[PDB]
A paper describes a structure:
Highly polymorphic class I molecules encoded by the major histocompatibility complex (MHC) are crucial in the adaptive immune response to viruses and some intracellular bacteria, binding peptides inside the cell and presenting them on the cell surface to CD8 T lymphocytes. In contrast, chicken TAP genes are highly polymorphic, with each haplotype encoding a TAP molecule with a peptide-translocation specificity matching the peptide-binding specificity of the dominantly expressed class I molecule encoded by the BF2 gene, with the BF1 gene expressed poorly or not at all. In this paper, we find that two other haplotypes known to confer resistance to Marek's disease also have low cell surface expression and promiscuous peptide motifs, and examine the structural basis for promiscuous binding in three low expressing molecules. Second, we show that peptide-binding repertoire and level of cell surface expression are inversely correlated in both chickens and humans, indicating that this relationship is a fundamental property of class I molecules.
All of the other B2 peptides have generally smaller hydrophobic amino acids at P2 and somewhat larger hydrophobic amino acids at Pc. Crystal structures with two of these peptides, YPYLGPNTL and VIFPAKSL, show that Pro and Ile at peptide position P2 and Leu at Pc bind shallow hydrophobic pockets, similar to the way in which anchor residues bind pockets B and F in many mammalian class I molecules. This mode of binding is completely different from BF2*2101 that remodels the binding site, despite the fact that BF2*0201 shares Asp24 and Arg9 with BF2*2101. Structures of BF2*0201 and BF2*1401 show promiscuous binding via hydrophobic binding pockets for the anchor residues at peptide position P2 and Pc, with the class I residues at positions 24 and 9 playing supporting roles, and with residues lining the pockets explaining the relative size of anchor residues. The differences in pocket sizes are primarily due to difference in size between Val43(45) and Tyr43(45) for pocket B and between Asp113(116) and Met113(116) for pocket F, which are supported by a network of hydrogen bonds from Thr24 and Gln9 in BF2*1401 and from Asp24 and Arg9 in BF2*0201. In BF2*0201 and BF2*1401, the two Ser residues are replaced by the large residues Asn69(70) and Tyr97(99), creating a constricted groove much more like narrow grooves found in high expressing fastidious molecules such as BF2*0401. The anchor residues for HLA-A2 fit into narrow and specific-binding pockets, which allow almost only P2 Met and Leu for pocket B and Pc Val and Leu for pocket F. Although Leu and Val in particular are relatively common in proteins (so that the number of peptides bearing these amino acids should be relatively high), there is a much larger number of hydrophobic amino acids that are accommodated by the shallower pockets in both BF2*0201 and BF2*1401.
Residue numbers in the entry:
A (entry chain D): 1 to 272
B (entry chain F): 1 to 9
C (entry chain E): 2 to 97
């Protein structure tokens, strides 16, 4: 049903010691598959399916865009410095554009930008006009409307983006459609007169998972602390929840784990 | 597949 | 914005067994951040700095991970140096 393509850039003035200033990255269904670097100057695959099922002209043609996309962002950084009347320092340019599809057809199409952690511009496809969030982005709105780049973006977001996305899903249908089961461990420790239990699901896929604490067969969303869902190195996800409770009450609490991989939601109890 | 440009700000 | 850091392992913390320690900072700006994983106040050998990114609200996040073997007694933690934090903050890995 729902498949999402998203490309993302990050041009930086002060990236750090021994780090690249510009990086361009792509994501399919919330999973990293394509990567570009300013040091390497070539697009490279992160997943197996995109690497296996792609010719050289795909990479060479994509690299020419990446080397292009690197060059404009060098010019951009300099343009904003003069527009804001800034001497220099730690500034960054961000780009965020993609396309969503449901049962074949497209639903959403976006093309945005932010400067120094704040929205700069955004392409509204329905009205066929770019929006100026900040007074410093008003010149860009006039530039991008006079020269109809909006016609070019509509062609990309609706036609180009979708045709490539359908192909990417077909290549990694097995690797996107797979399901991995979470290795769950329950543990608790005394803090300062208060027992602090903690459920910890390790390696699982897909991303969205529901983990909660059940006191006496009843969901307790009070006193529960969660750190959200966080990624791993090998294309899988991790989560963690903890609950403050009275000492001795160990058998009362239970960690329920609801996930797509599991048909029945598995309950876990603390037993050492 | 990425989109080239279109142009500077 | 200050980074929200979380230290955790890939697999269950079994002593003397192959594992991958992970440090994940997220929700910070600017993106220039120096995340280092340490074993007993000393940076871990090897290491693997993964790719960075940012969420829908233009806020950054970086993952760093390293293949290792957790020995008993040895203390593991993730040092993080950022412009917002003023002084470096150390996040400790709690096994089990």
């Amino acid at each position: 049903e729902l498949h999402t393509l998203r490309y993302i850039r990050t041009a930086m003035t002060d990236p750090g010691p021994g780090l690249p200033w510009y990086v361009d990255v792509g994501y399919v269904d919330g999973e990293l598959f394509v990567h570009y670097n300013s040091t390497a100057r070539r697009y490279v695959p992160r997943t197996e399916w995109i690497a296996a099922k792609a010719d050289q002209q795909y990479w060479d043609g994509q690299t020419q865009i990446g080397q292009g996309n690197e060059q404009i962002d060098r010019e951009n950084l300099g343009i904003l410095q003069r527009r804001y009347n800034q001497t220099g320092g730690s500034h960054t340019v961000q780009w965020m554009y993609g396309c969503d599809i449901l049962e074949g057809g497209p639903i959403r199409g976006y093309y945005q930008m932010a400067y120094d952690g704040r929205d700069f511009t955004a392409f509204d496809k329905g009205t066929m006009t770019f929006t100026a969030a900040v007074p410093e982005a008003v010149p860009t709105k006039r530039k991008w409307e006079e020269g109809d780049y909006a016609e070019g973006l509509k062609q990309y977001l609706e036609e180009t983006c979708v045709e490539w996305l359908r192909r990417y899903v077909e290549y990694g249908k097995a690797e996107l459609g797979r399901r991995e089961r979470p290795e769950v461990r329950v543990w608790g420790k005394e803090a300062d007169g208060i027992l602090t239990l903690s459920c910890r699901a390790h390696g699982f896929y897909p991303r969205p998972i529901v983990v909660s604490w059940l006191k006496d067969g009843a969901v307790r969303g009070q006193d529960a602390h969660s750190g959200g869902i966080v990624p791993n190195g090998d294309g899988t996800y991790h989560t963690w929840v903890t609950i403050d409770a009275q000492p001795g009450d160990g058998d009362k609490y239970q960690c329920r784990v609801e996930h797509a991989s599991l048909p029945q939601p598995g309950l876990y109890s603390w037993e050492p | 597949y990425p989109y080239l440009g279109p142009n500077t700000l | 914005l200050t980074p929200k850091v979380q230290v955790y392992s890939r697999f269950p913390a079994s002593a003397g067994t192959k594992n991958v320690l992970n440090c994940f900072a997220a929700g910070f700006h600017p993106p220039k951040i120096s995340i280092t994983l340490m074993k007993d106040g000393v940076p871990m050998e090897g290491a693997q700095y993964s790719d960075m990114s940012f969420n829908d609200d233009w806020t950054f996040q970086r993952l760093v991970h390293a293949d290792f073997t957790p020995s008993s007694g040895s203390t593991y933690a993730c040092k993080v140096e950022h412009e917002t934090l003023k002084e470096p903050q150390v996040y400790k890995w709690d096994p089990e």
